[PDB]
Design a protein around this ligand. Sequence first.
Ligand SMILES: Cc1c(Nc2c(F)ccc(NS(=O)(=O)CCCF)c2Cl)ccc2ncn(C)c(=O)c12
Length: 272
Amino acid sequence: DDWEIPDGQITVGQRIGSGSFGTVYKGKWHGDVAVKMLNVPTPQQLQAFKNEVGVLRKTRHVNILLFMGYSTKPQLAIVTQWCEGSSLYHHLHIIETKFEMIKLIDIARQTAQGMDYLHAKSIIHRDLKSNNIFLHEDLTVKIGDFGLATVKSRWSGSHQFEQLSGSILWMAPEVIRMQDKNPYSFQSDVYAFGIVLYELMTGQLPYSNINNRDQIIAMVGAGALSPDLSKVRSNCPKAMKRLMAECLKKKRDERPLFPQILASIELLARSL
Ligand SMILES: Cc1c(Nc2c(F)ccc(NS(=O)(=O)CCCF)c2Cl)ccc2ncn(C)c(=O)c12
């Protein structure tokens, strides 16, 4: 495979963080890059990993984090562009950046634009959340962390337990239960997007009044817990508040898909 970066070319730099799936470093390879290093594979796992890289190779869009190559030594790794800036999670919940409503709407629009692109390519993200949406140069949304779905979800020792803890807030009721036919769908991505909209339009994570992540898992999975939409800022447009409730519908068939979502956001942006 021609997308393997030969060993010895990448220089690792700053450790950005160690998540439930891999550690990300800033790096140098023809300039700044990000390097996500996975676990410390059999021939079958190497072939499966290359198959997953095939999915990443399908994505070429300015709202999608740019895949640049992969490595197998010292460990399996994914190399992408380096985003100059912070994630949406960092802005909203850590440093509490005060975006104007017009810019919050634009961030929502750009996120929907990337999701629409993925879905058009038959890619279900499965892991959308504000800490893998990066605000590049404070201007351009880049969505990442949709790669290696089979590696993340199916391989032994991929820290699935930790992944659950880190993703529960964005996870649709049917993804929690995994009982319905095809629990991961375009519609479950829409629900996660609905939670990102909640974060943008309230400045808060959902369920901040519920201390217990187990109660959240059980309650959302039972269809008995939804974000408190009364916390949306006073200047959030009513059409945007309605859209957010549509994306968050507990019954997945009631959720709009991203062509409709994009048209709604674009209409209200161009209505100001
Ligand atoms: C955390 C992070 C990443 N993470 C990251 C990565 F390193 C490698 C792959 C994926 N995702 S992927 O699905 O495997 C590929 C998707 C495209 F194909 C992601 Cl999300 C990337 C760039 C970053 N730039 C700036 N900053 C501040 C960051 O924190 C940052």
